[PDB]
Amino acid sequence: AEKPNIVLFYVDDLGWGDLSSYGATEVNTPNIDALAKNGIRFTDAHSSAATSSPSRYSLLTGEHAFRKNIRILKGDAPLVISEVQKTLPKMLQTVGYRTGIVGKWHLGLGDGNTPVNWNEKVKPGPLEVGFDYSFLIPATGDRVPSVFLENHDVVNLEKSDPLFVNYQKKIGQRPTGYENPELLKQGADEQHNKSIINGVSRIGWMQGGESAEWHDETFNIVTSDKAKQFISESSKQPFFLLFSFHDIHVPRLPNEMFRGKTNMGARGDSIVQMDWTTGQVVEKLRELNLLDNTLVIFTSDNGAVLTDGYDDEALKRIGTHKQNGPYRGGKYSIYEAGTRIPFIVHYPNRVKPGVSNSLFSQIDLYASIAELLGVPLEETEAIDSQNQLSPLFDASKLARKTLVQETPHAKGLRENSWKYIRPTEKDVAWVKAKKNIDPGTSKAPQLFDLDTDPSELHNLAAKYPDKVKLLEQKLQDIELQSIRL
Amino acid sequence: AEKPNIVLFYVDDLGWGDLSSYGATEVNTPNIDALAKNGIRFTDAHSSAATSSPSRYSLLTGEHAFRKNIRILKGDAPLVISEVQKTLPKMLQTVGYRTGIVGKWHLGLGDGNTPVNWNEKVKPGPLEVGFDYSFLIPATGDRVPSVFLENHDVVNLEKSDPLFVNYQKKIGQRPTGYENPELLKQGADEQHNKSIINGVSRIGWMQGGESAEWHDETFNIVTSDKAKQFISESSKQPFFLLFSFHDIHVPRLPNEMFRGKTNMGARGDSIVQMDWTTGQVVEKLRELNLLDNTLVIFTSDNGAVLTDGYDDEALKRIGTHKQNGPYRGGKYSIYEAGTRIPFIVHYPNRVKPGVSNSLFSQIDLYASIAELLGVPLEETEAIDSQNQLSPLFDASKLARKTLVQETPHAKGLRENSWKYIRPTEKDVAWVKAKKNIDPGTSKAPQLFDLDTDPSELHNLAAKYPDKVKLLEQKLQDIELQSIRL
């Protein structure tokens, strides 16, 4: 009653403008739009980072990812969340929640002492950082191993055909993108052209594990079934479900029933699938009469990207679609579209519909949920997570004044509508070339007023150097922070 | 010194983001960017209307186009500016200016009593509403007759092969788009598939006049040559040159030297050509040492359109390019991109470089030039044109607080960053279907705050119903205005 269920939909690479309730016209997202229409949609909400693993780290620890220098993790990275580190699911466990995760992990698995043996129990993982149940795509959809990991075991593995991966050289006898292009459903760049699983090459080589191979085009069935089973089993008790999409990350291989539903190719059709999958979970909540007393949160790990490694026509068939809305940048960028993402709260018993323009941070989910449940936080716990339950539940309330934005190549700072980008000597020309996204680095400081210049086009750094200095000093204060408030 | 030259570059359908100095990365416009770098670039400047003829009418009469119900004129429409109406070129003539126009007219030509006889002298026209010299594309590039009109005469017309046009039925023996698709340089929709001139079908049928046919791919030479001659001849005297591009209107048929300069097809290559043509006129002013004492204004008649009637791949090869920047809509729309256009002032002897965010109106060019030259205006003259010479010349000065925006299906109103759109029952679904642009009509009133919602996505009408009433009242006051101030 006083402990509502929490379901956190976490989409992969969903851009600010990829929902029809955020202005999309080339794709319809009716299931997600109903949540927004009956809840609050936020226009200035942010992931911690512009790439997956750092934003997932900050969601779960309530702490900026640079404090542990988290970057995009490889398929065999060790777990980046410590087994005694405070986490949002662990926090929820102490008040009686059953916690589950279904879908993408990308937070590392194992201790790192020795390579993960995919044929033994895989630990530590989700179950050691506060999850009671986990059903994972271990790394990313485009990184081997292309298998599911349930709790501690690879699903449907045969002792007769053990599983190994290698990210430096070919092992095993699977066809590859570079040797066998005639077997490919989509062309792939050099990073992505290794072992072929289910007609698509991945990053890295995979040996064995044939019976454990997943089937991309039925991710929507597999994950939604597991999510439905978890909810149904936990229905008599408070539960936390983190539903971690592979959509709309590459390779986009949507179920055949969504193919051609848009004129944007595989990327647009993945948005349709992603919306269907959400409806499956929402309707299960409704039919068990859990929906009005569930805090549903729908959001994204980073901003959007069209061309991310496969020849899936995402850029050729973009049409009129503005995947990042009016905002400059995208995935990997320090401009606004790197972290400014869709963010929807739906909680009928407590949250009246509205639209909030408050500067809001996913990093504050930890402390705001702790506030909702009366959980005190230690002075060293989730140090960046602020109690923002009030603007989270009420569209008229303000939230942050200041928020740091993070990428590997540069840090930035929002202060109200001011946007500051720290200069860097680092060279990231591969983002413009390969990703068709301006990463946003300049060897000069950048300052923008988003009210008049929402697309970050007119650098005001030389017009307001005192403002630049003030924002850089504020960014240093945050980098140096070590306890709460 | 006190009577500077005025050269007004007026581009066809140039979107807010189609210049590299407004953020374009898929096309470079170095000549125009140099004008912005050494002058004022405006970020909130507006044509009066979202279509050609109403915005040209308002440019020349200093009066909103709805006061005469001006709409897109077909090729044989009569002159919409009366021979005794006060006009900006007529105003300039009384102060010692030689006035010329080179390029697109689209303001009508007959007196309306009888159809224009293209084989006789064509009057009234530019010479009857304040121009001393005119070399015209009479209607639009895609409307017959595909001939030039110099002063009162069709250029290179032969009595032995007289010229006739018909917009309702086929006349003459010219091939047509519907009969002879194998002759077309580009595919055409039904409105555009009539008489073939120079390998491209047009709107309407054209008979005779073979020697007077223009050549689209040499418009850049013809118009820049005519503008260079006019400047060269009038160089010893103050002059006003209105240089009215066909670029980047359909059909986009740029000179061969610009083909392939962008990866956007014919539309992108037309932006490059348009930039070359501007440089030709700018460099002629420089060679005659007139550039420093010339007020150069570069702007556009309405917002951008990709698919406007020909299969020129404008939408298929758009790539990452945002022709309207962050703004919703485009050509034909009542949303911001309908009228929010590029606007650059270059006048080194009086105008210091800068970027201005002031709400600015092309309609105010009449009164602001009158102020610059000390010309008093009658109480019934250019009634919507306000003196805004100060923010025109100074990037630090504010201009308008209120501005009405015009389309045939609905009117709108800006008040600071508030945007109000009046409701309408009228049906313009063909804009979405044929033009891939949201025309912006809703049966309900719309109100947006552009500071937080620059893309006009969150209707605030029901949250601030008093603000709606205020702006509707301001809009009616303007509709009822009849004199100046």
Ligand SMILES: O=S(=O)(O)OC[C@H]1O[C@@H](O)[C@H](O)[C@@H](O)[C@H]1O
């Ligand atoms: O959303 S993320 O998981 O952070 O994306 C990780 C990315 O790694 C990059 O190195 C690849 O080229 C991308 O294709 C993508 O896999």
Ligand SMILES: O=S(=O)(O)OC[C@H]1O[C@@H](O)[C@H](O)[C@@H](O)[C@H]1O
């Ligand atoms: O810039 S404008 O002259 O207003 O464009 C006029 C437009 O009229 C429409 O009926 C045609 O489909 C367009 O192709 C275009 O010619």
Ligand SMILES: [Ca+2]
């Ligand atoms: Ca991601």
Ligand SMILES: [Ca+2]
């Ligand atoms: Ca136009």
Ligand SMILES: [Cl-]
């Ligand atoms: Cl990285």
Ligand SMILES: [Cl-]
């Ligand atoms: Cl990698």
Ligand SMILES: [Cl-]
């Ligand atoms: Cl490559």
Ligand SMILES: [Cl-]
């Ligand atoms: Cl019209």
Ligand SMILES: [Cl-]
């Ligand atoms: Cl010359």
